[PDB]
Amino acid sequence: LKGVVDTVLLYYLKGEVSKEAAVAILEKILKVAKALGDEELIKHASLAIEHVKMD
Amino acid sequence: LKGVVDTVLLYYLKGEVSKEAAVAILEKILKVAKALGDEELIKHASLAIEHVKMD
Ligand SMILES: [Zn+2]
Ligand SMILES: [Zn+2]
């Protein structure tokens, strides 16, 4: 679930996903990664979410 | 200077430049951005730096 975040980010930066599909998938993955206990994936998904949301 | 950060991130996630080179270029860009007065790109470069440095 760490390569999925980078896959979504990479496909966003090439302009093949939108700010709507990407955020939906990344919040689903952050939900998975916050109920798993990983603090190294909570923050990974959080950084990806901040990048896709605003910037 | 907003496309430079995305180019560095996109070439890092693609796994074809480096971790050292990406962080060096992004610290240069963050220095320019913090000596420009635009906090819309200060945090963009800071997020890219957090991603490349740690995750
Ligand atoms: Zn990543
Ligand atoms: Zn960006």
* A vs B: CB pairs below 8 A: 28
DSSP assignment letter at A16: S
- Identity at B12, one-letter amino acid code: Y
Q: Is B52 on the interface with A (CB under 8 A)?
A: no
- The closest ligand to the CA of B2 turns out to be 2
Q: What residues in A contact B43, CB-CB < 8 Å?
A: 55
Resolution of this deposited model, Å: 3.2
Helix-, strand-, coil-residue percentages of chain B, each rounded to 5 = 75, 0, 25
Q: How were these coordinates obtained? A: cryo-EM
> Residue A28 sits in which domain range?
3-53
Q: Are residues B11 and B22 in contact, defined by beta-carbon separation less than 8 angstroms?
A: yes
Q: How many domains does chain A have?
A: 1
For residue A49, the surrounding DSSP H or E stretch is: helix A39-53
Angle between helix A21-34 and A3-13 (nearest 10): 160
Residue A3: partners with Cβ closer than 8 Å, 6 or more residues away:
none
Nearest to B13 among A6, A40, A50 (CB): A6
Number of Cβ within a 10 Å radius of residue B22: 20
> What three-state secondary structure class fits B20?
helix
